[PDB]
Amino acid sequence: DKITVFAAASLTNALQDIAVQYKQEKQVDVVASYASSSTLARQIEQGAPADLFISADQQWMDYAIDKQQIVANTRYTLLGNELVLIAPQDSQIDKVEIDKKTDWKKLLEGGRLAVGDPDHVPAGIYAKESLENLGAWSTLAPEMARANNVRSAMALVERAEAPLGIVYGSDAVASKKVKVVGIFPEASHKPVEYPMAIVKGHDNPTVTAFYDYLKSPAAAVIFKNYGFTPR
Incomplete structure (x- = not known):
């Protein structure tokens, strides 16, 4: 029934x-x-x-x-799921190889990196784990827009207020206004x-x-x- x-x-x-x-x-x-x-x-x-x-x-x-x-x-x-790097759909960024050498500052060009607040949002906790393992956390910490939930983080990217964000693969599929430009290495964070x-x-x-x-x-x-x- x-x-x-x-x-x-x-x-x-x-x-x-x-x-x-x-x-x-x-x-x-x-x-x-x-x-x-x-x-x-x-x-x-x-x-x-x-x-x-x-x-x-x-x-x-x-x-x-x-x-x-x-x-x-x-x-x-x-x-x-995968942990992914997203950009607004029409961004000039299309493919980012994510590793210890990624030039995050050149990619952001002074814009913010939209994340779930890494103190509590799942996508933010995974983002912090991956970025710590990649050696990029400290340089990006003051560049993050730390949103109260993953929807709010993704909205910054949908509106092209933040040039990059970190969400789950399925989040990027849900939102037709963002595209996946990179996949965080699966070795670098706990599985989703x-x-x-x-x-x-x-x-x-x-x-x-x-x-x-x-x-x-x-x-x-x-x-x-x-x-x-x-x-």
């Missing part, structure tokens, strides 16, 4: 498309709440009745499992990974069928459309 999914908000467009298709094919209504992974996990801990949880990171899945709210043996890393799991008490055939659908080729097509890497 109805499946309730708690999903990281970045998954909205992909999961909405998947839910429409699943209702059409299987006559099951999938309804999703979209929010930060931490809030979804705490709400499950506090008794909210979700059937499935898709986190945008492994740490909040660890939290939900350690609270004994999850069928831990269903944990499945569903998607990956989205685990899913069934919530304890919701391990029934209906929920399992949708869980299986999420990791099937039909859903993979839709995740790829929105810039995620199906695993």
